[PDB]
Amino acid sequence: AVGACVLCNSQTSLRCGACIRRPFLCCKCCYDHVISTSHKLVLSVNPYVCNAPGCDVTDVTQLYLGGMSYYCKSHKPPISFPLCANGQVFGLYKVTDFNAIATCDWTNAGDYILANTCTERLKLFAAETLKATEETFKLSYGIATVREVLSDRELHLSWEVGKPRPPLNRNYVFTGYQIGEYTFEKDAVVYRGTTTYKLNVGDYFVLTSHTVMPLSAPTLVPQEHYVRITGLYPTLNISDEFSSNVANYQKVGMQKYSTLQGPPGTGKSHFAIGLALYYPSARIVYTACSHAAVDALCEKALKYLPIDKCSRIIPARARVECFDKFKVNSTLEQYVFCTVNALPETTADIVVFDEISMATNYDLSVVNARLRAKHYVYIGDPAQLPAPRTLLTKGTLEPEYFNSVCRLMKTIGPDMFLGTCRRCPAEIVDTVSALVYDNKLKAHKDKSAQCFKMFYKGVITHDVSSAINRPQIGVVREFLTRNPAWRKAVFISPYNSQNAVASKILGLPTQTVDSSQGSEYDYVIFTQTTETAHSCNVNRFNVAITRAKVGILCIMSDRDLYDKLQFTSLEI
Numbered sequence: 001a002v003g004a005c006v007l008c009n010s011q012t013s014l015r016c017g018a019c020i021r022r023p024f025l026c027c028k029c030c031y032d033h034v035i036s037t038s039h040k041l042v043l044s045v046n047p048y049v050c051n052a053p054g055c056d057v058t059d060v061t062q063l064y065l066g067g068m069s070y071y072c073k074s075h076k077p078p079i080s081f082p083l084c085a086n087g088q089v090f091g092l093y094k095v096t097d098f099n100a101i102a103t104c105d106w107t108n109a110g111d112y113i114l115a116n117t118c119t120e121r122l123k124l125f126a127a128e129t130l131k132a133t134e135e136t137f138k139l140s141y142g143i144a145t146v147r148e149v150l151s152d153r154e155l156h157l158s159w160e161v162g163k164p165r166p167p168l169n170r171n172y173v174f175t176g177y178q179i180g181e182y183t184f185e186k187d188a189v190v191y192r193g194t195t196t197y198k199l200n201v202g203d204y205f206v207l208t209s210h211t212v213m214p215l216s217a218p219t220l221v222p223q224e225h226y227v228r229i230t231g232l233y234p235t236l237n238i239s240d241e242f243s244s245n246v247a248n249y250q251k252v253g254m255q256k257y258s259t260l261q262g263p264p265g266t267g268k269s270h271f272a273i274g275l276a277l278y279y280p281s282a283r284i285v286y287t288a289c290s291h292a293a294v295d296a297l298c299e300k301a302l303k304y305l306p307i308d309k310c311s312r313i314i315p316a317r318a319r320v321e322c323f324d325k326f327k328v329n330s331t332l333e334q335y336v337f338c339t340v341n342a343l344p345e346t347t348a349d350i351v352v353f354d355e356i357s358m359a360t361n362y363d364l365s366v367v368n369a370r371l372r373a374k375h376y377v378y379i380g381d382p383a384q385l386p387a388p389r390t391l392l393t394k395g396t397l398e399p400e401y402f403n404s405v406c407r408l409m410k411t412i413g414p415d416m417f418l419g420t421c422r423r424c425p426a427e428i429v430d431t432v433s434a435l436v437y438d439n440k441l442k443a444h445k446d447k448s449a450q451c452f453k454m455f456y457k458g459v460i461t462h463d464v465s466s467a468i469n470r471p472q473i474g475v476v477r478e479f480l481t482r483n484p485a486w487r488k489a490v491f492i493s494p495y496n497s498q499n500a501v502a503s504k505i506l507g508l509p510t511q512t513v514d515s516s517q518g519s520e521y522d523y524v525i526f527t528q529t530t531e532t533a534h535s536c537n538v539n540r541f542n543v544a545i546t547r548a549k550v551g552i553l554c555i556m557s558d559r560d561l562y563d564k565l566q567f568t569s570l571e572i
């Protein structure tokens with residue numbers, strides 16, 4: 001009930017009772033807060049409320065100290081001092097940005113801008129407040145009760161009346177009733193239960209609302225620059241394969257933390273695993289937010305690092321199937337691969353945090369609190385997709401506001417940049433290099449002459465809000481008949497409902513742009529589906545077209561992105 005002020009660290013017995021996270025506020029900052037916001041409840045050992053029987057005055061600005069107790073203007077004794085005076089709130093041990101973080105509903109982009117441009121302590125207050133708001137918002141949704149079980153992969157649902165229905169995609173995971181986590185895709189609905197269970201008729205599902213823990217560690221530790229490589233011992237015999245990253249691996253040992261911007265297919269996991277070969281005795285913890293990112297790091301480690309020194313950390317709540325080729329839950333192995341949410345409390349010579357555009361400041365802080373390392377390496381790309389912000393409906397969130405690492409990469413630049421894309425045909429590399437990389441990304445491959453674009457608006461229909469463009473899928477079907485090599489293509493679009501329709505009509509494996517990030521395929525067929533801020537987002541567009549190793553077909557809706565594609569146009 002006594003602690004440090006979130007704005008100036010000054011000790012206090014005061015906590016704001018109207019703030020969802022009840023932060024400690026000192027006398028000067030508590031005053032500036034209550035006198036400028038709707039927040040008037042102040043908490044101490046006992047709350048600041050009128051002690052007179054049956055009185056409901058709780059507003060600190062309307063209360064006084066009558067001896068050792070608190071009373072309003074109607075109940076105070078003659079000798080009483082106002083709780084609010086001379087810019088202070090009376091307590092013990094006797095902000096415009098804090099006010100906005102404390103009172104916003106997190107539905108605007110400007111709220112996330114502020115959460116990332118503020119002081120470090122306010123970045124943690126903002127991340128805690130936002131995550132708690134995101135969880136209390138899960139309570140504000142309807143329950144789905146099983147009406148009829150059709151097959152082992154399909155069922156019918158009855159929804160709660162008076163409460164909205166959550167979007168049925170992979171971004172919304174329900175907990176079944178504790179009969180395992182379940183996911184849904186669109187009267188017949190498709191069910192994907194993490195645990196294989198005979199889906200009982202009438203049993204209910206509810207979105208998991210986890211408790212938001214407080215943040216202690218900064219999003220980024222204070223930067224330290226060294227004169228020599230510190231606490232790391234380089235090999236003198238470094239494999240030719242990894243020679244291109246030697247100057248960068250040295251930069252890593254000569255700073256507390258370093259940022260690496262790696263565009264698609266420029267060698268991020270090769271850099272991450274090569275860092276272990278460069279400092280062969282260093283204990284490295286490899287972390288990312290998703291199980292897919294962590295597994296991709298495991299796949300790369302399996303090829304270069306001794307398997308007996310690797311461990312994949314998987315929590316007892318085994319959400320989805322992940323990497324099976326390392327000893328499980330051996331926290332003490334030299335190489336530990338683990339998602340941010342499952343991190344043990346341990347130390348490391350190097351912590352490598354991959355897919356950094358997907359991290360939030362909450363994730364950045366958790367890593368700093370669970371892992372005490374000599375060096376921290378942040379690998380990702382601010383030109384790729386950020387983590388979904390479920391509350392954000394108004395405005396677009398720019399890359400410089402994704403998190404603290406992305407803010408640094410977009411303002412002062414990354415410490416290291418992988419400049420040569422080895423995956424994509426040059427048509428794709430030249431397009432994204434100009435689009436999001438200021439012409440600094442170079443192509444290793446020649447033009448494949450298998451990159452096509454077709455400008456076709458089609459017809460936009462909707463499955464609630466998720467969009468479908470059947471004419472664009474018809475154009476793909478026509479193209480496939482004339483281009484049989486493309487039979488092996490992955491169908492990509494910005495919408496799951498478009499992908500569900502393409503799956504049935506084309507039979508191609510399907511992927512949203514957001515679920516394709518980090519993956520690569522020989523051929524990609526992309527249908528833009530709509531002209532929305534979502535389907536036109538340059539980061540999403542960047543990820544979409546950089547999935548292709550050999551060919552890409554883009555059926556476009558937006559003239560701007562279509563005209564920028566350095567692809568051969570097709571007719572019809």
Ligand SMILES: [Zn+2]
Binds near residue numbers: 006007009
């Ligand atoms: Zn203060």
Ligand SMILES: [Zn+2]
Binds near residue numbers: 017018033102
């Ligand atoms: Zn408050």
Ligand SMILES: [Zn+2]
Binds near residue numbers: 050055071072074075
């Ligand atoms: Zn009173």
